[PDB]
Write a protein that binds this DNA or RNA. Structure first.
Length: 223
DNA sequence: TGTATCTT
DNA sequence: AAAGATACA
């Protein structure tokens, strides 16, 4: 048992020996020596530990991990108990309350419940320097997360990609827009949420698409 | 003070 | 590249 889930490792391990990945891992190691980097090393790949890769139905793609202490744990927007949901997650919960009739605030911020249902909770960049949003961009993570999206694009059908923010949306070009369903809106951070996230109705729309394709919907209350 | 996006 | 301007606690 290790950092990568077995099915994810099987289909992404071809990246490990590539120069960009070696330089990426080297960069993160050096950063960890001189700064506080989030999430902890053992939690960078938590997004591979929640379901088999073939059972992914929905992809939520954000920018990068939470950059405050004890927040980021390898699932986009998620915080483990007893950590309070950050402003971004409270905004996600606010949208869910208007979008999903039966949804009420769960009283915690752990999104493992969604991930287990086949919702990939990915960020475009997978580490961050404390207190500095997007500080680890353009270092190799983009190419790696491109490999994640590209594998899913090729080996699946009728996926729902939810691309939240400019940086997540860079991956839109790698997705077959007829074969899969790309929904795009502003990042749920208070700095950007007012630019379309509120009222985007991504959660109900996702389930509409899934049910149309004959797939089981996500129970957004199941956390 | 703290939580993106556009523009240059 | 990287920095300045731009809802609500």
């Amino acid at each position: 048992m290790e950092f990568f889930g077995e099915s994810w490792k099987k289909h992404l391990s071809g990246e490990f020996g590539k120069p960009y990945f070696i330089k990426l891992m080297g960069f993160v190691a050096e950063e960890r020596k001189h700064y506080t980097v989030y999430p902890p090393p053992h939690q960078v790949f938590t997004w591979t530990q929640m379901c088999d890769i073939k059972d992914v139905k929905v992809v939520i793609l954000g920018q990068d991990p939470y950059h405050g202490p004890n927040q980021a744990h390898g699932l986009c927007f998620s915080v483990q108990r007893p950590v309070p949901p950050p402003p971004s997650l409270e905004n996600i919960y606010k949208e869910l309350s208007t979008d999903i009739e039966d949804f009420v605030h769960p009283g915690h911020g752990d999104l493992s419940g969604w991930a287990k249902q086949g919702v990939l909770l990915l960020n475009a960049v997978l580490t961050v320097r404390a207190h500095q949003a997007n500080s680890h961009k353009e270092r190799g993570w983009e190419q790696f997360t491109d490999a994640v999206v590209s594998w899913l694009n090729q080996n699946s059908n009728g996926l729902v990609f939810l691309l939240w923010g400019s940086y997540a949306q860079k991956k839109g070009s790698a997705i077959d827009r007829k074969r899969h369903h790309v929904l795009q809106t502003a990042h749920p951070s208070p700095l950007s949420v007012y630019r379309g996230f509120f009222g985007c109705r991504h959660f109900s729309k996702t389930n509409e698409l899934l049910q149309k394709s004959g797939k089981k919907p996500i129970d957004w209350k199941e956390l």
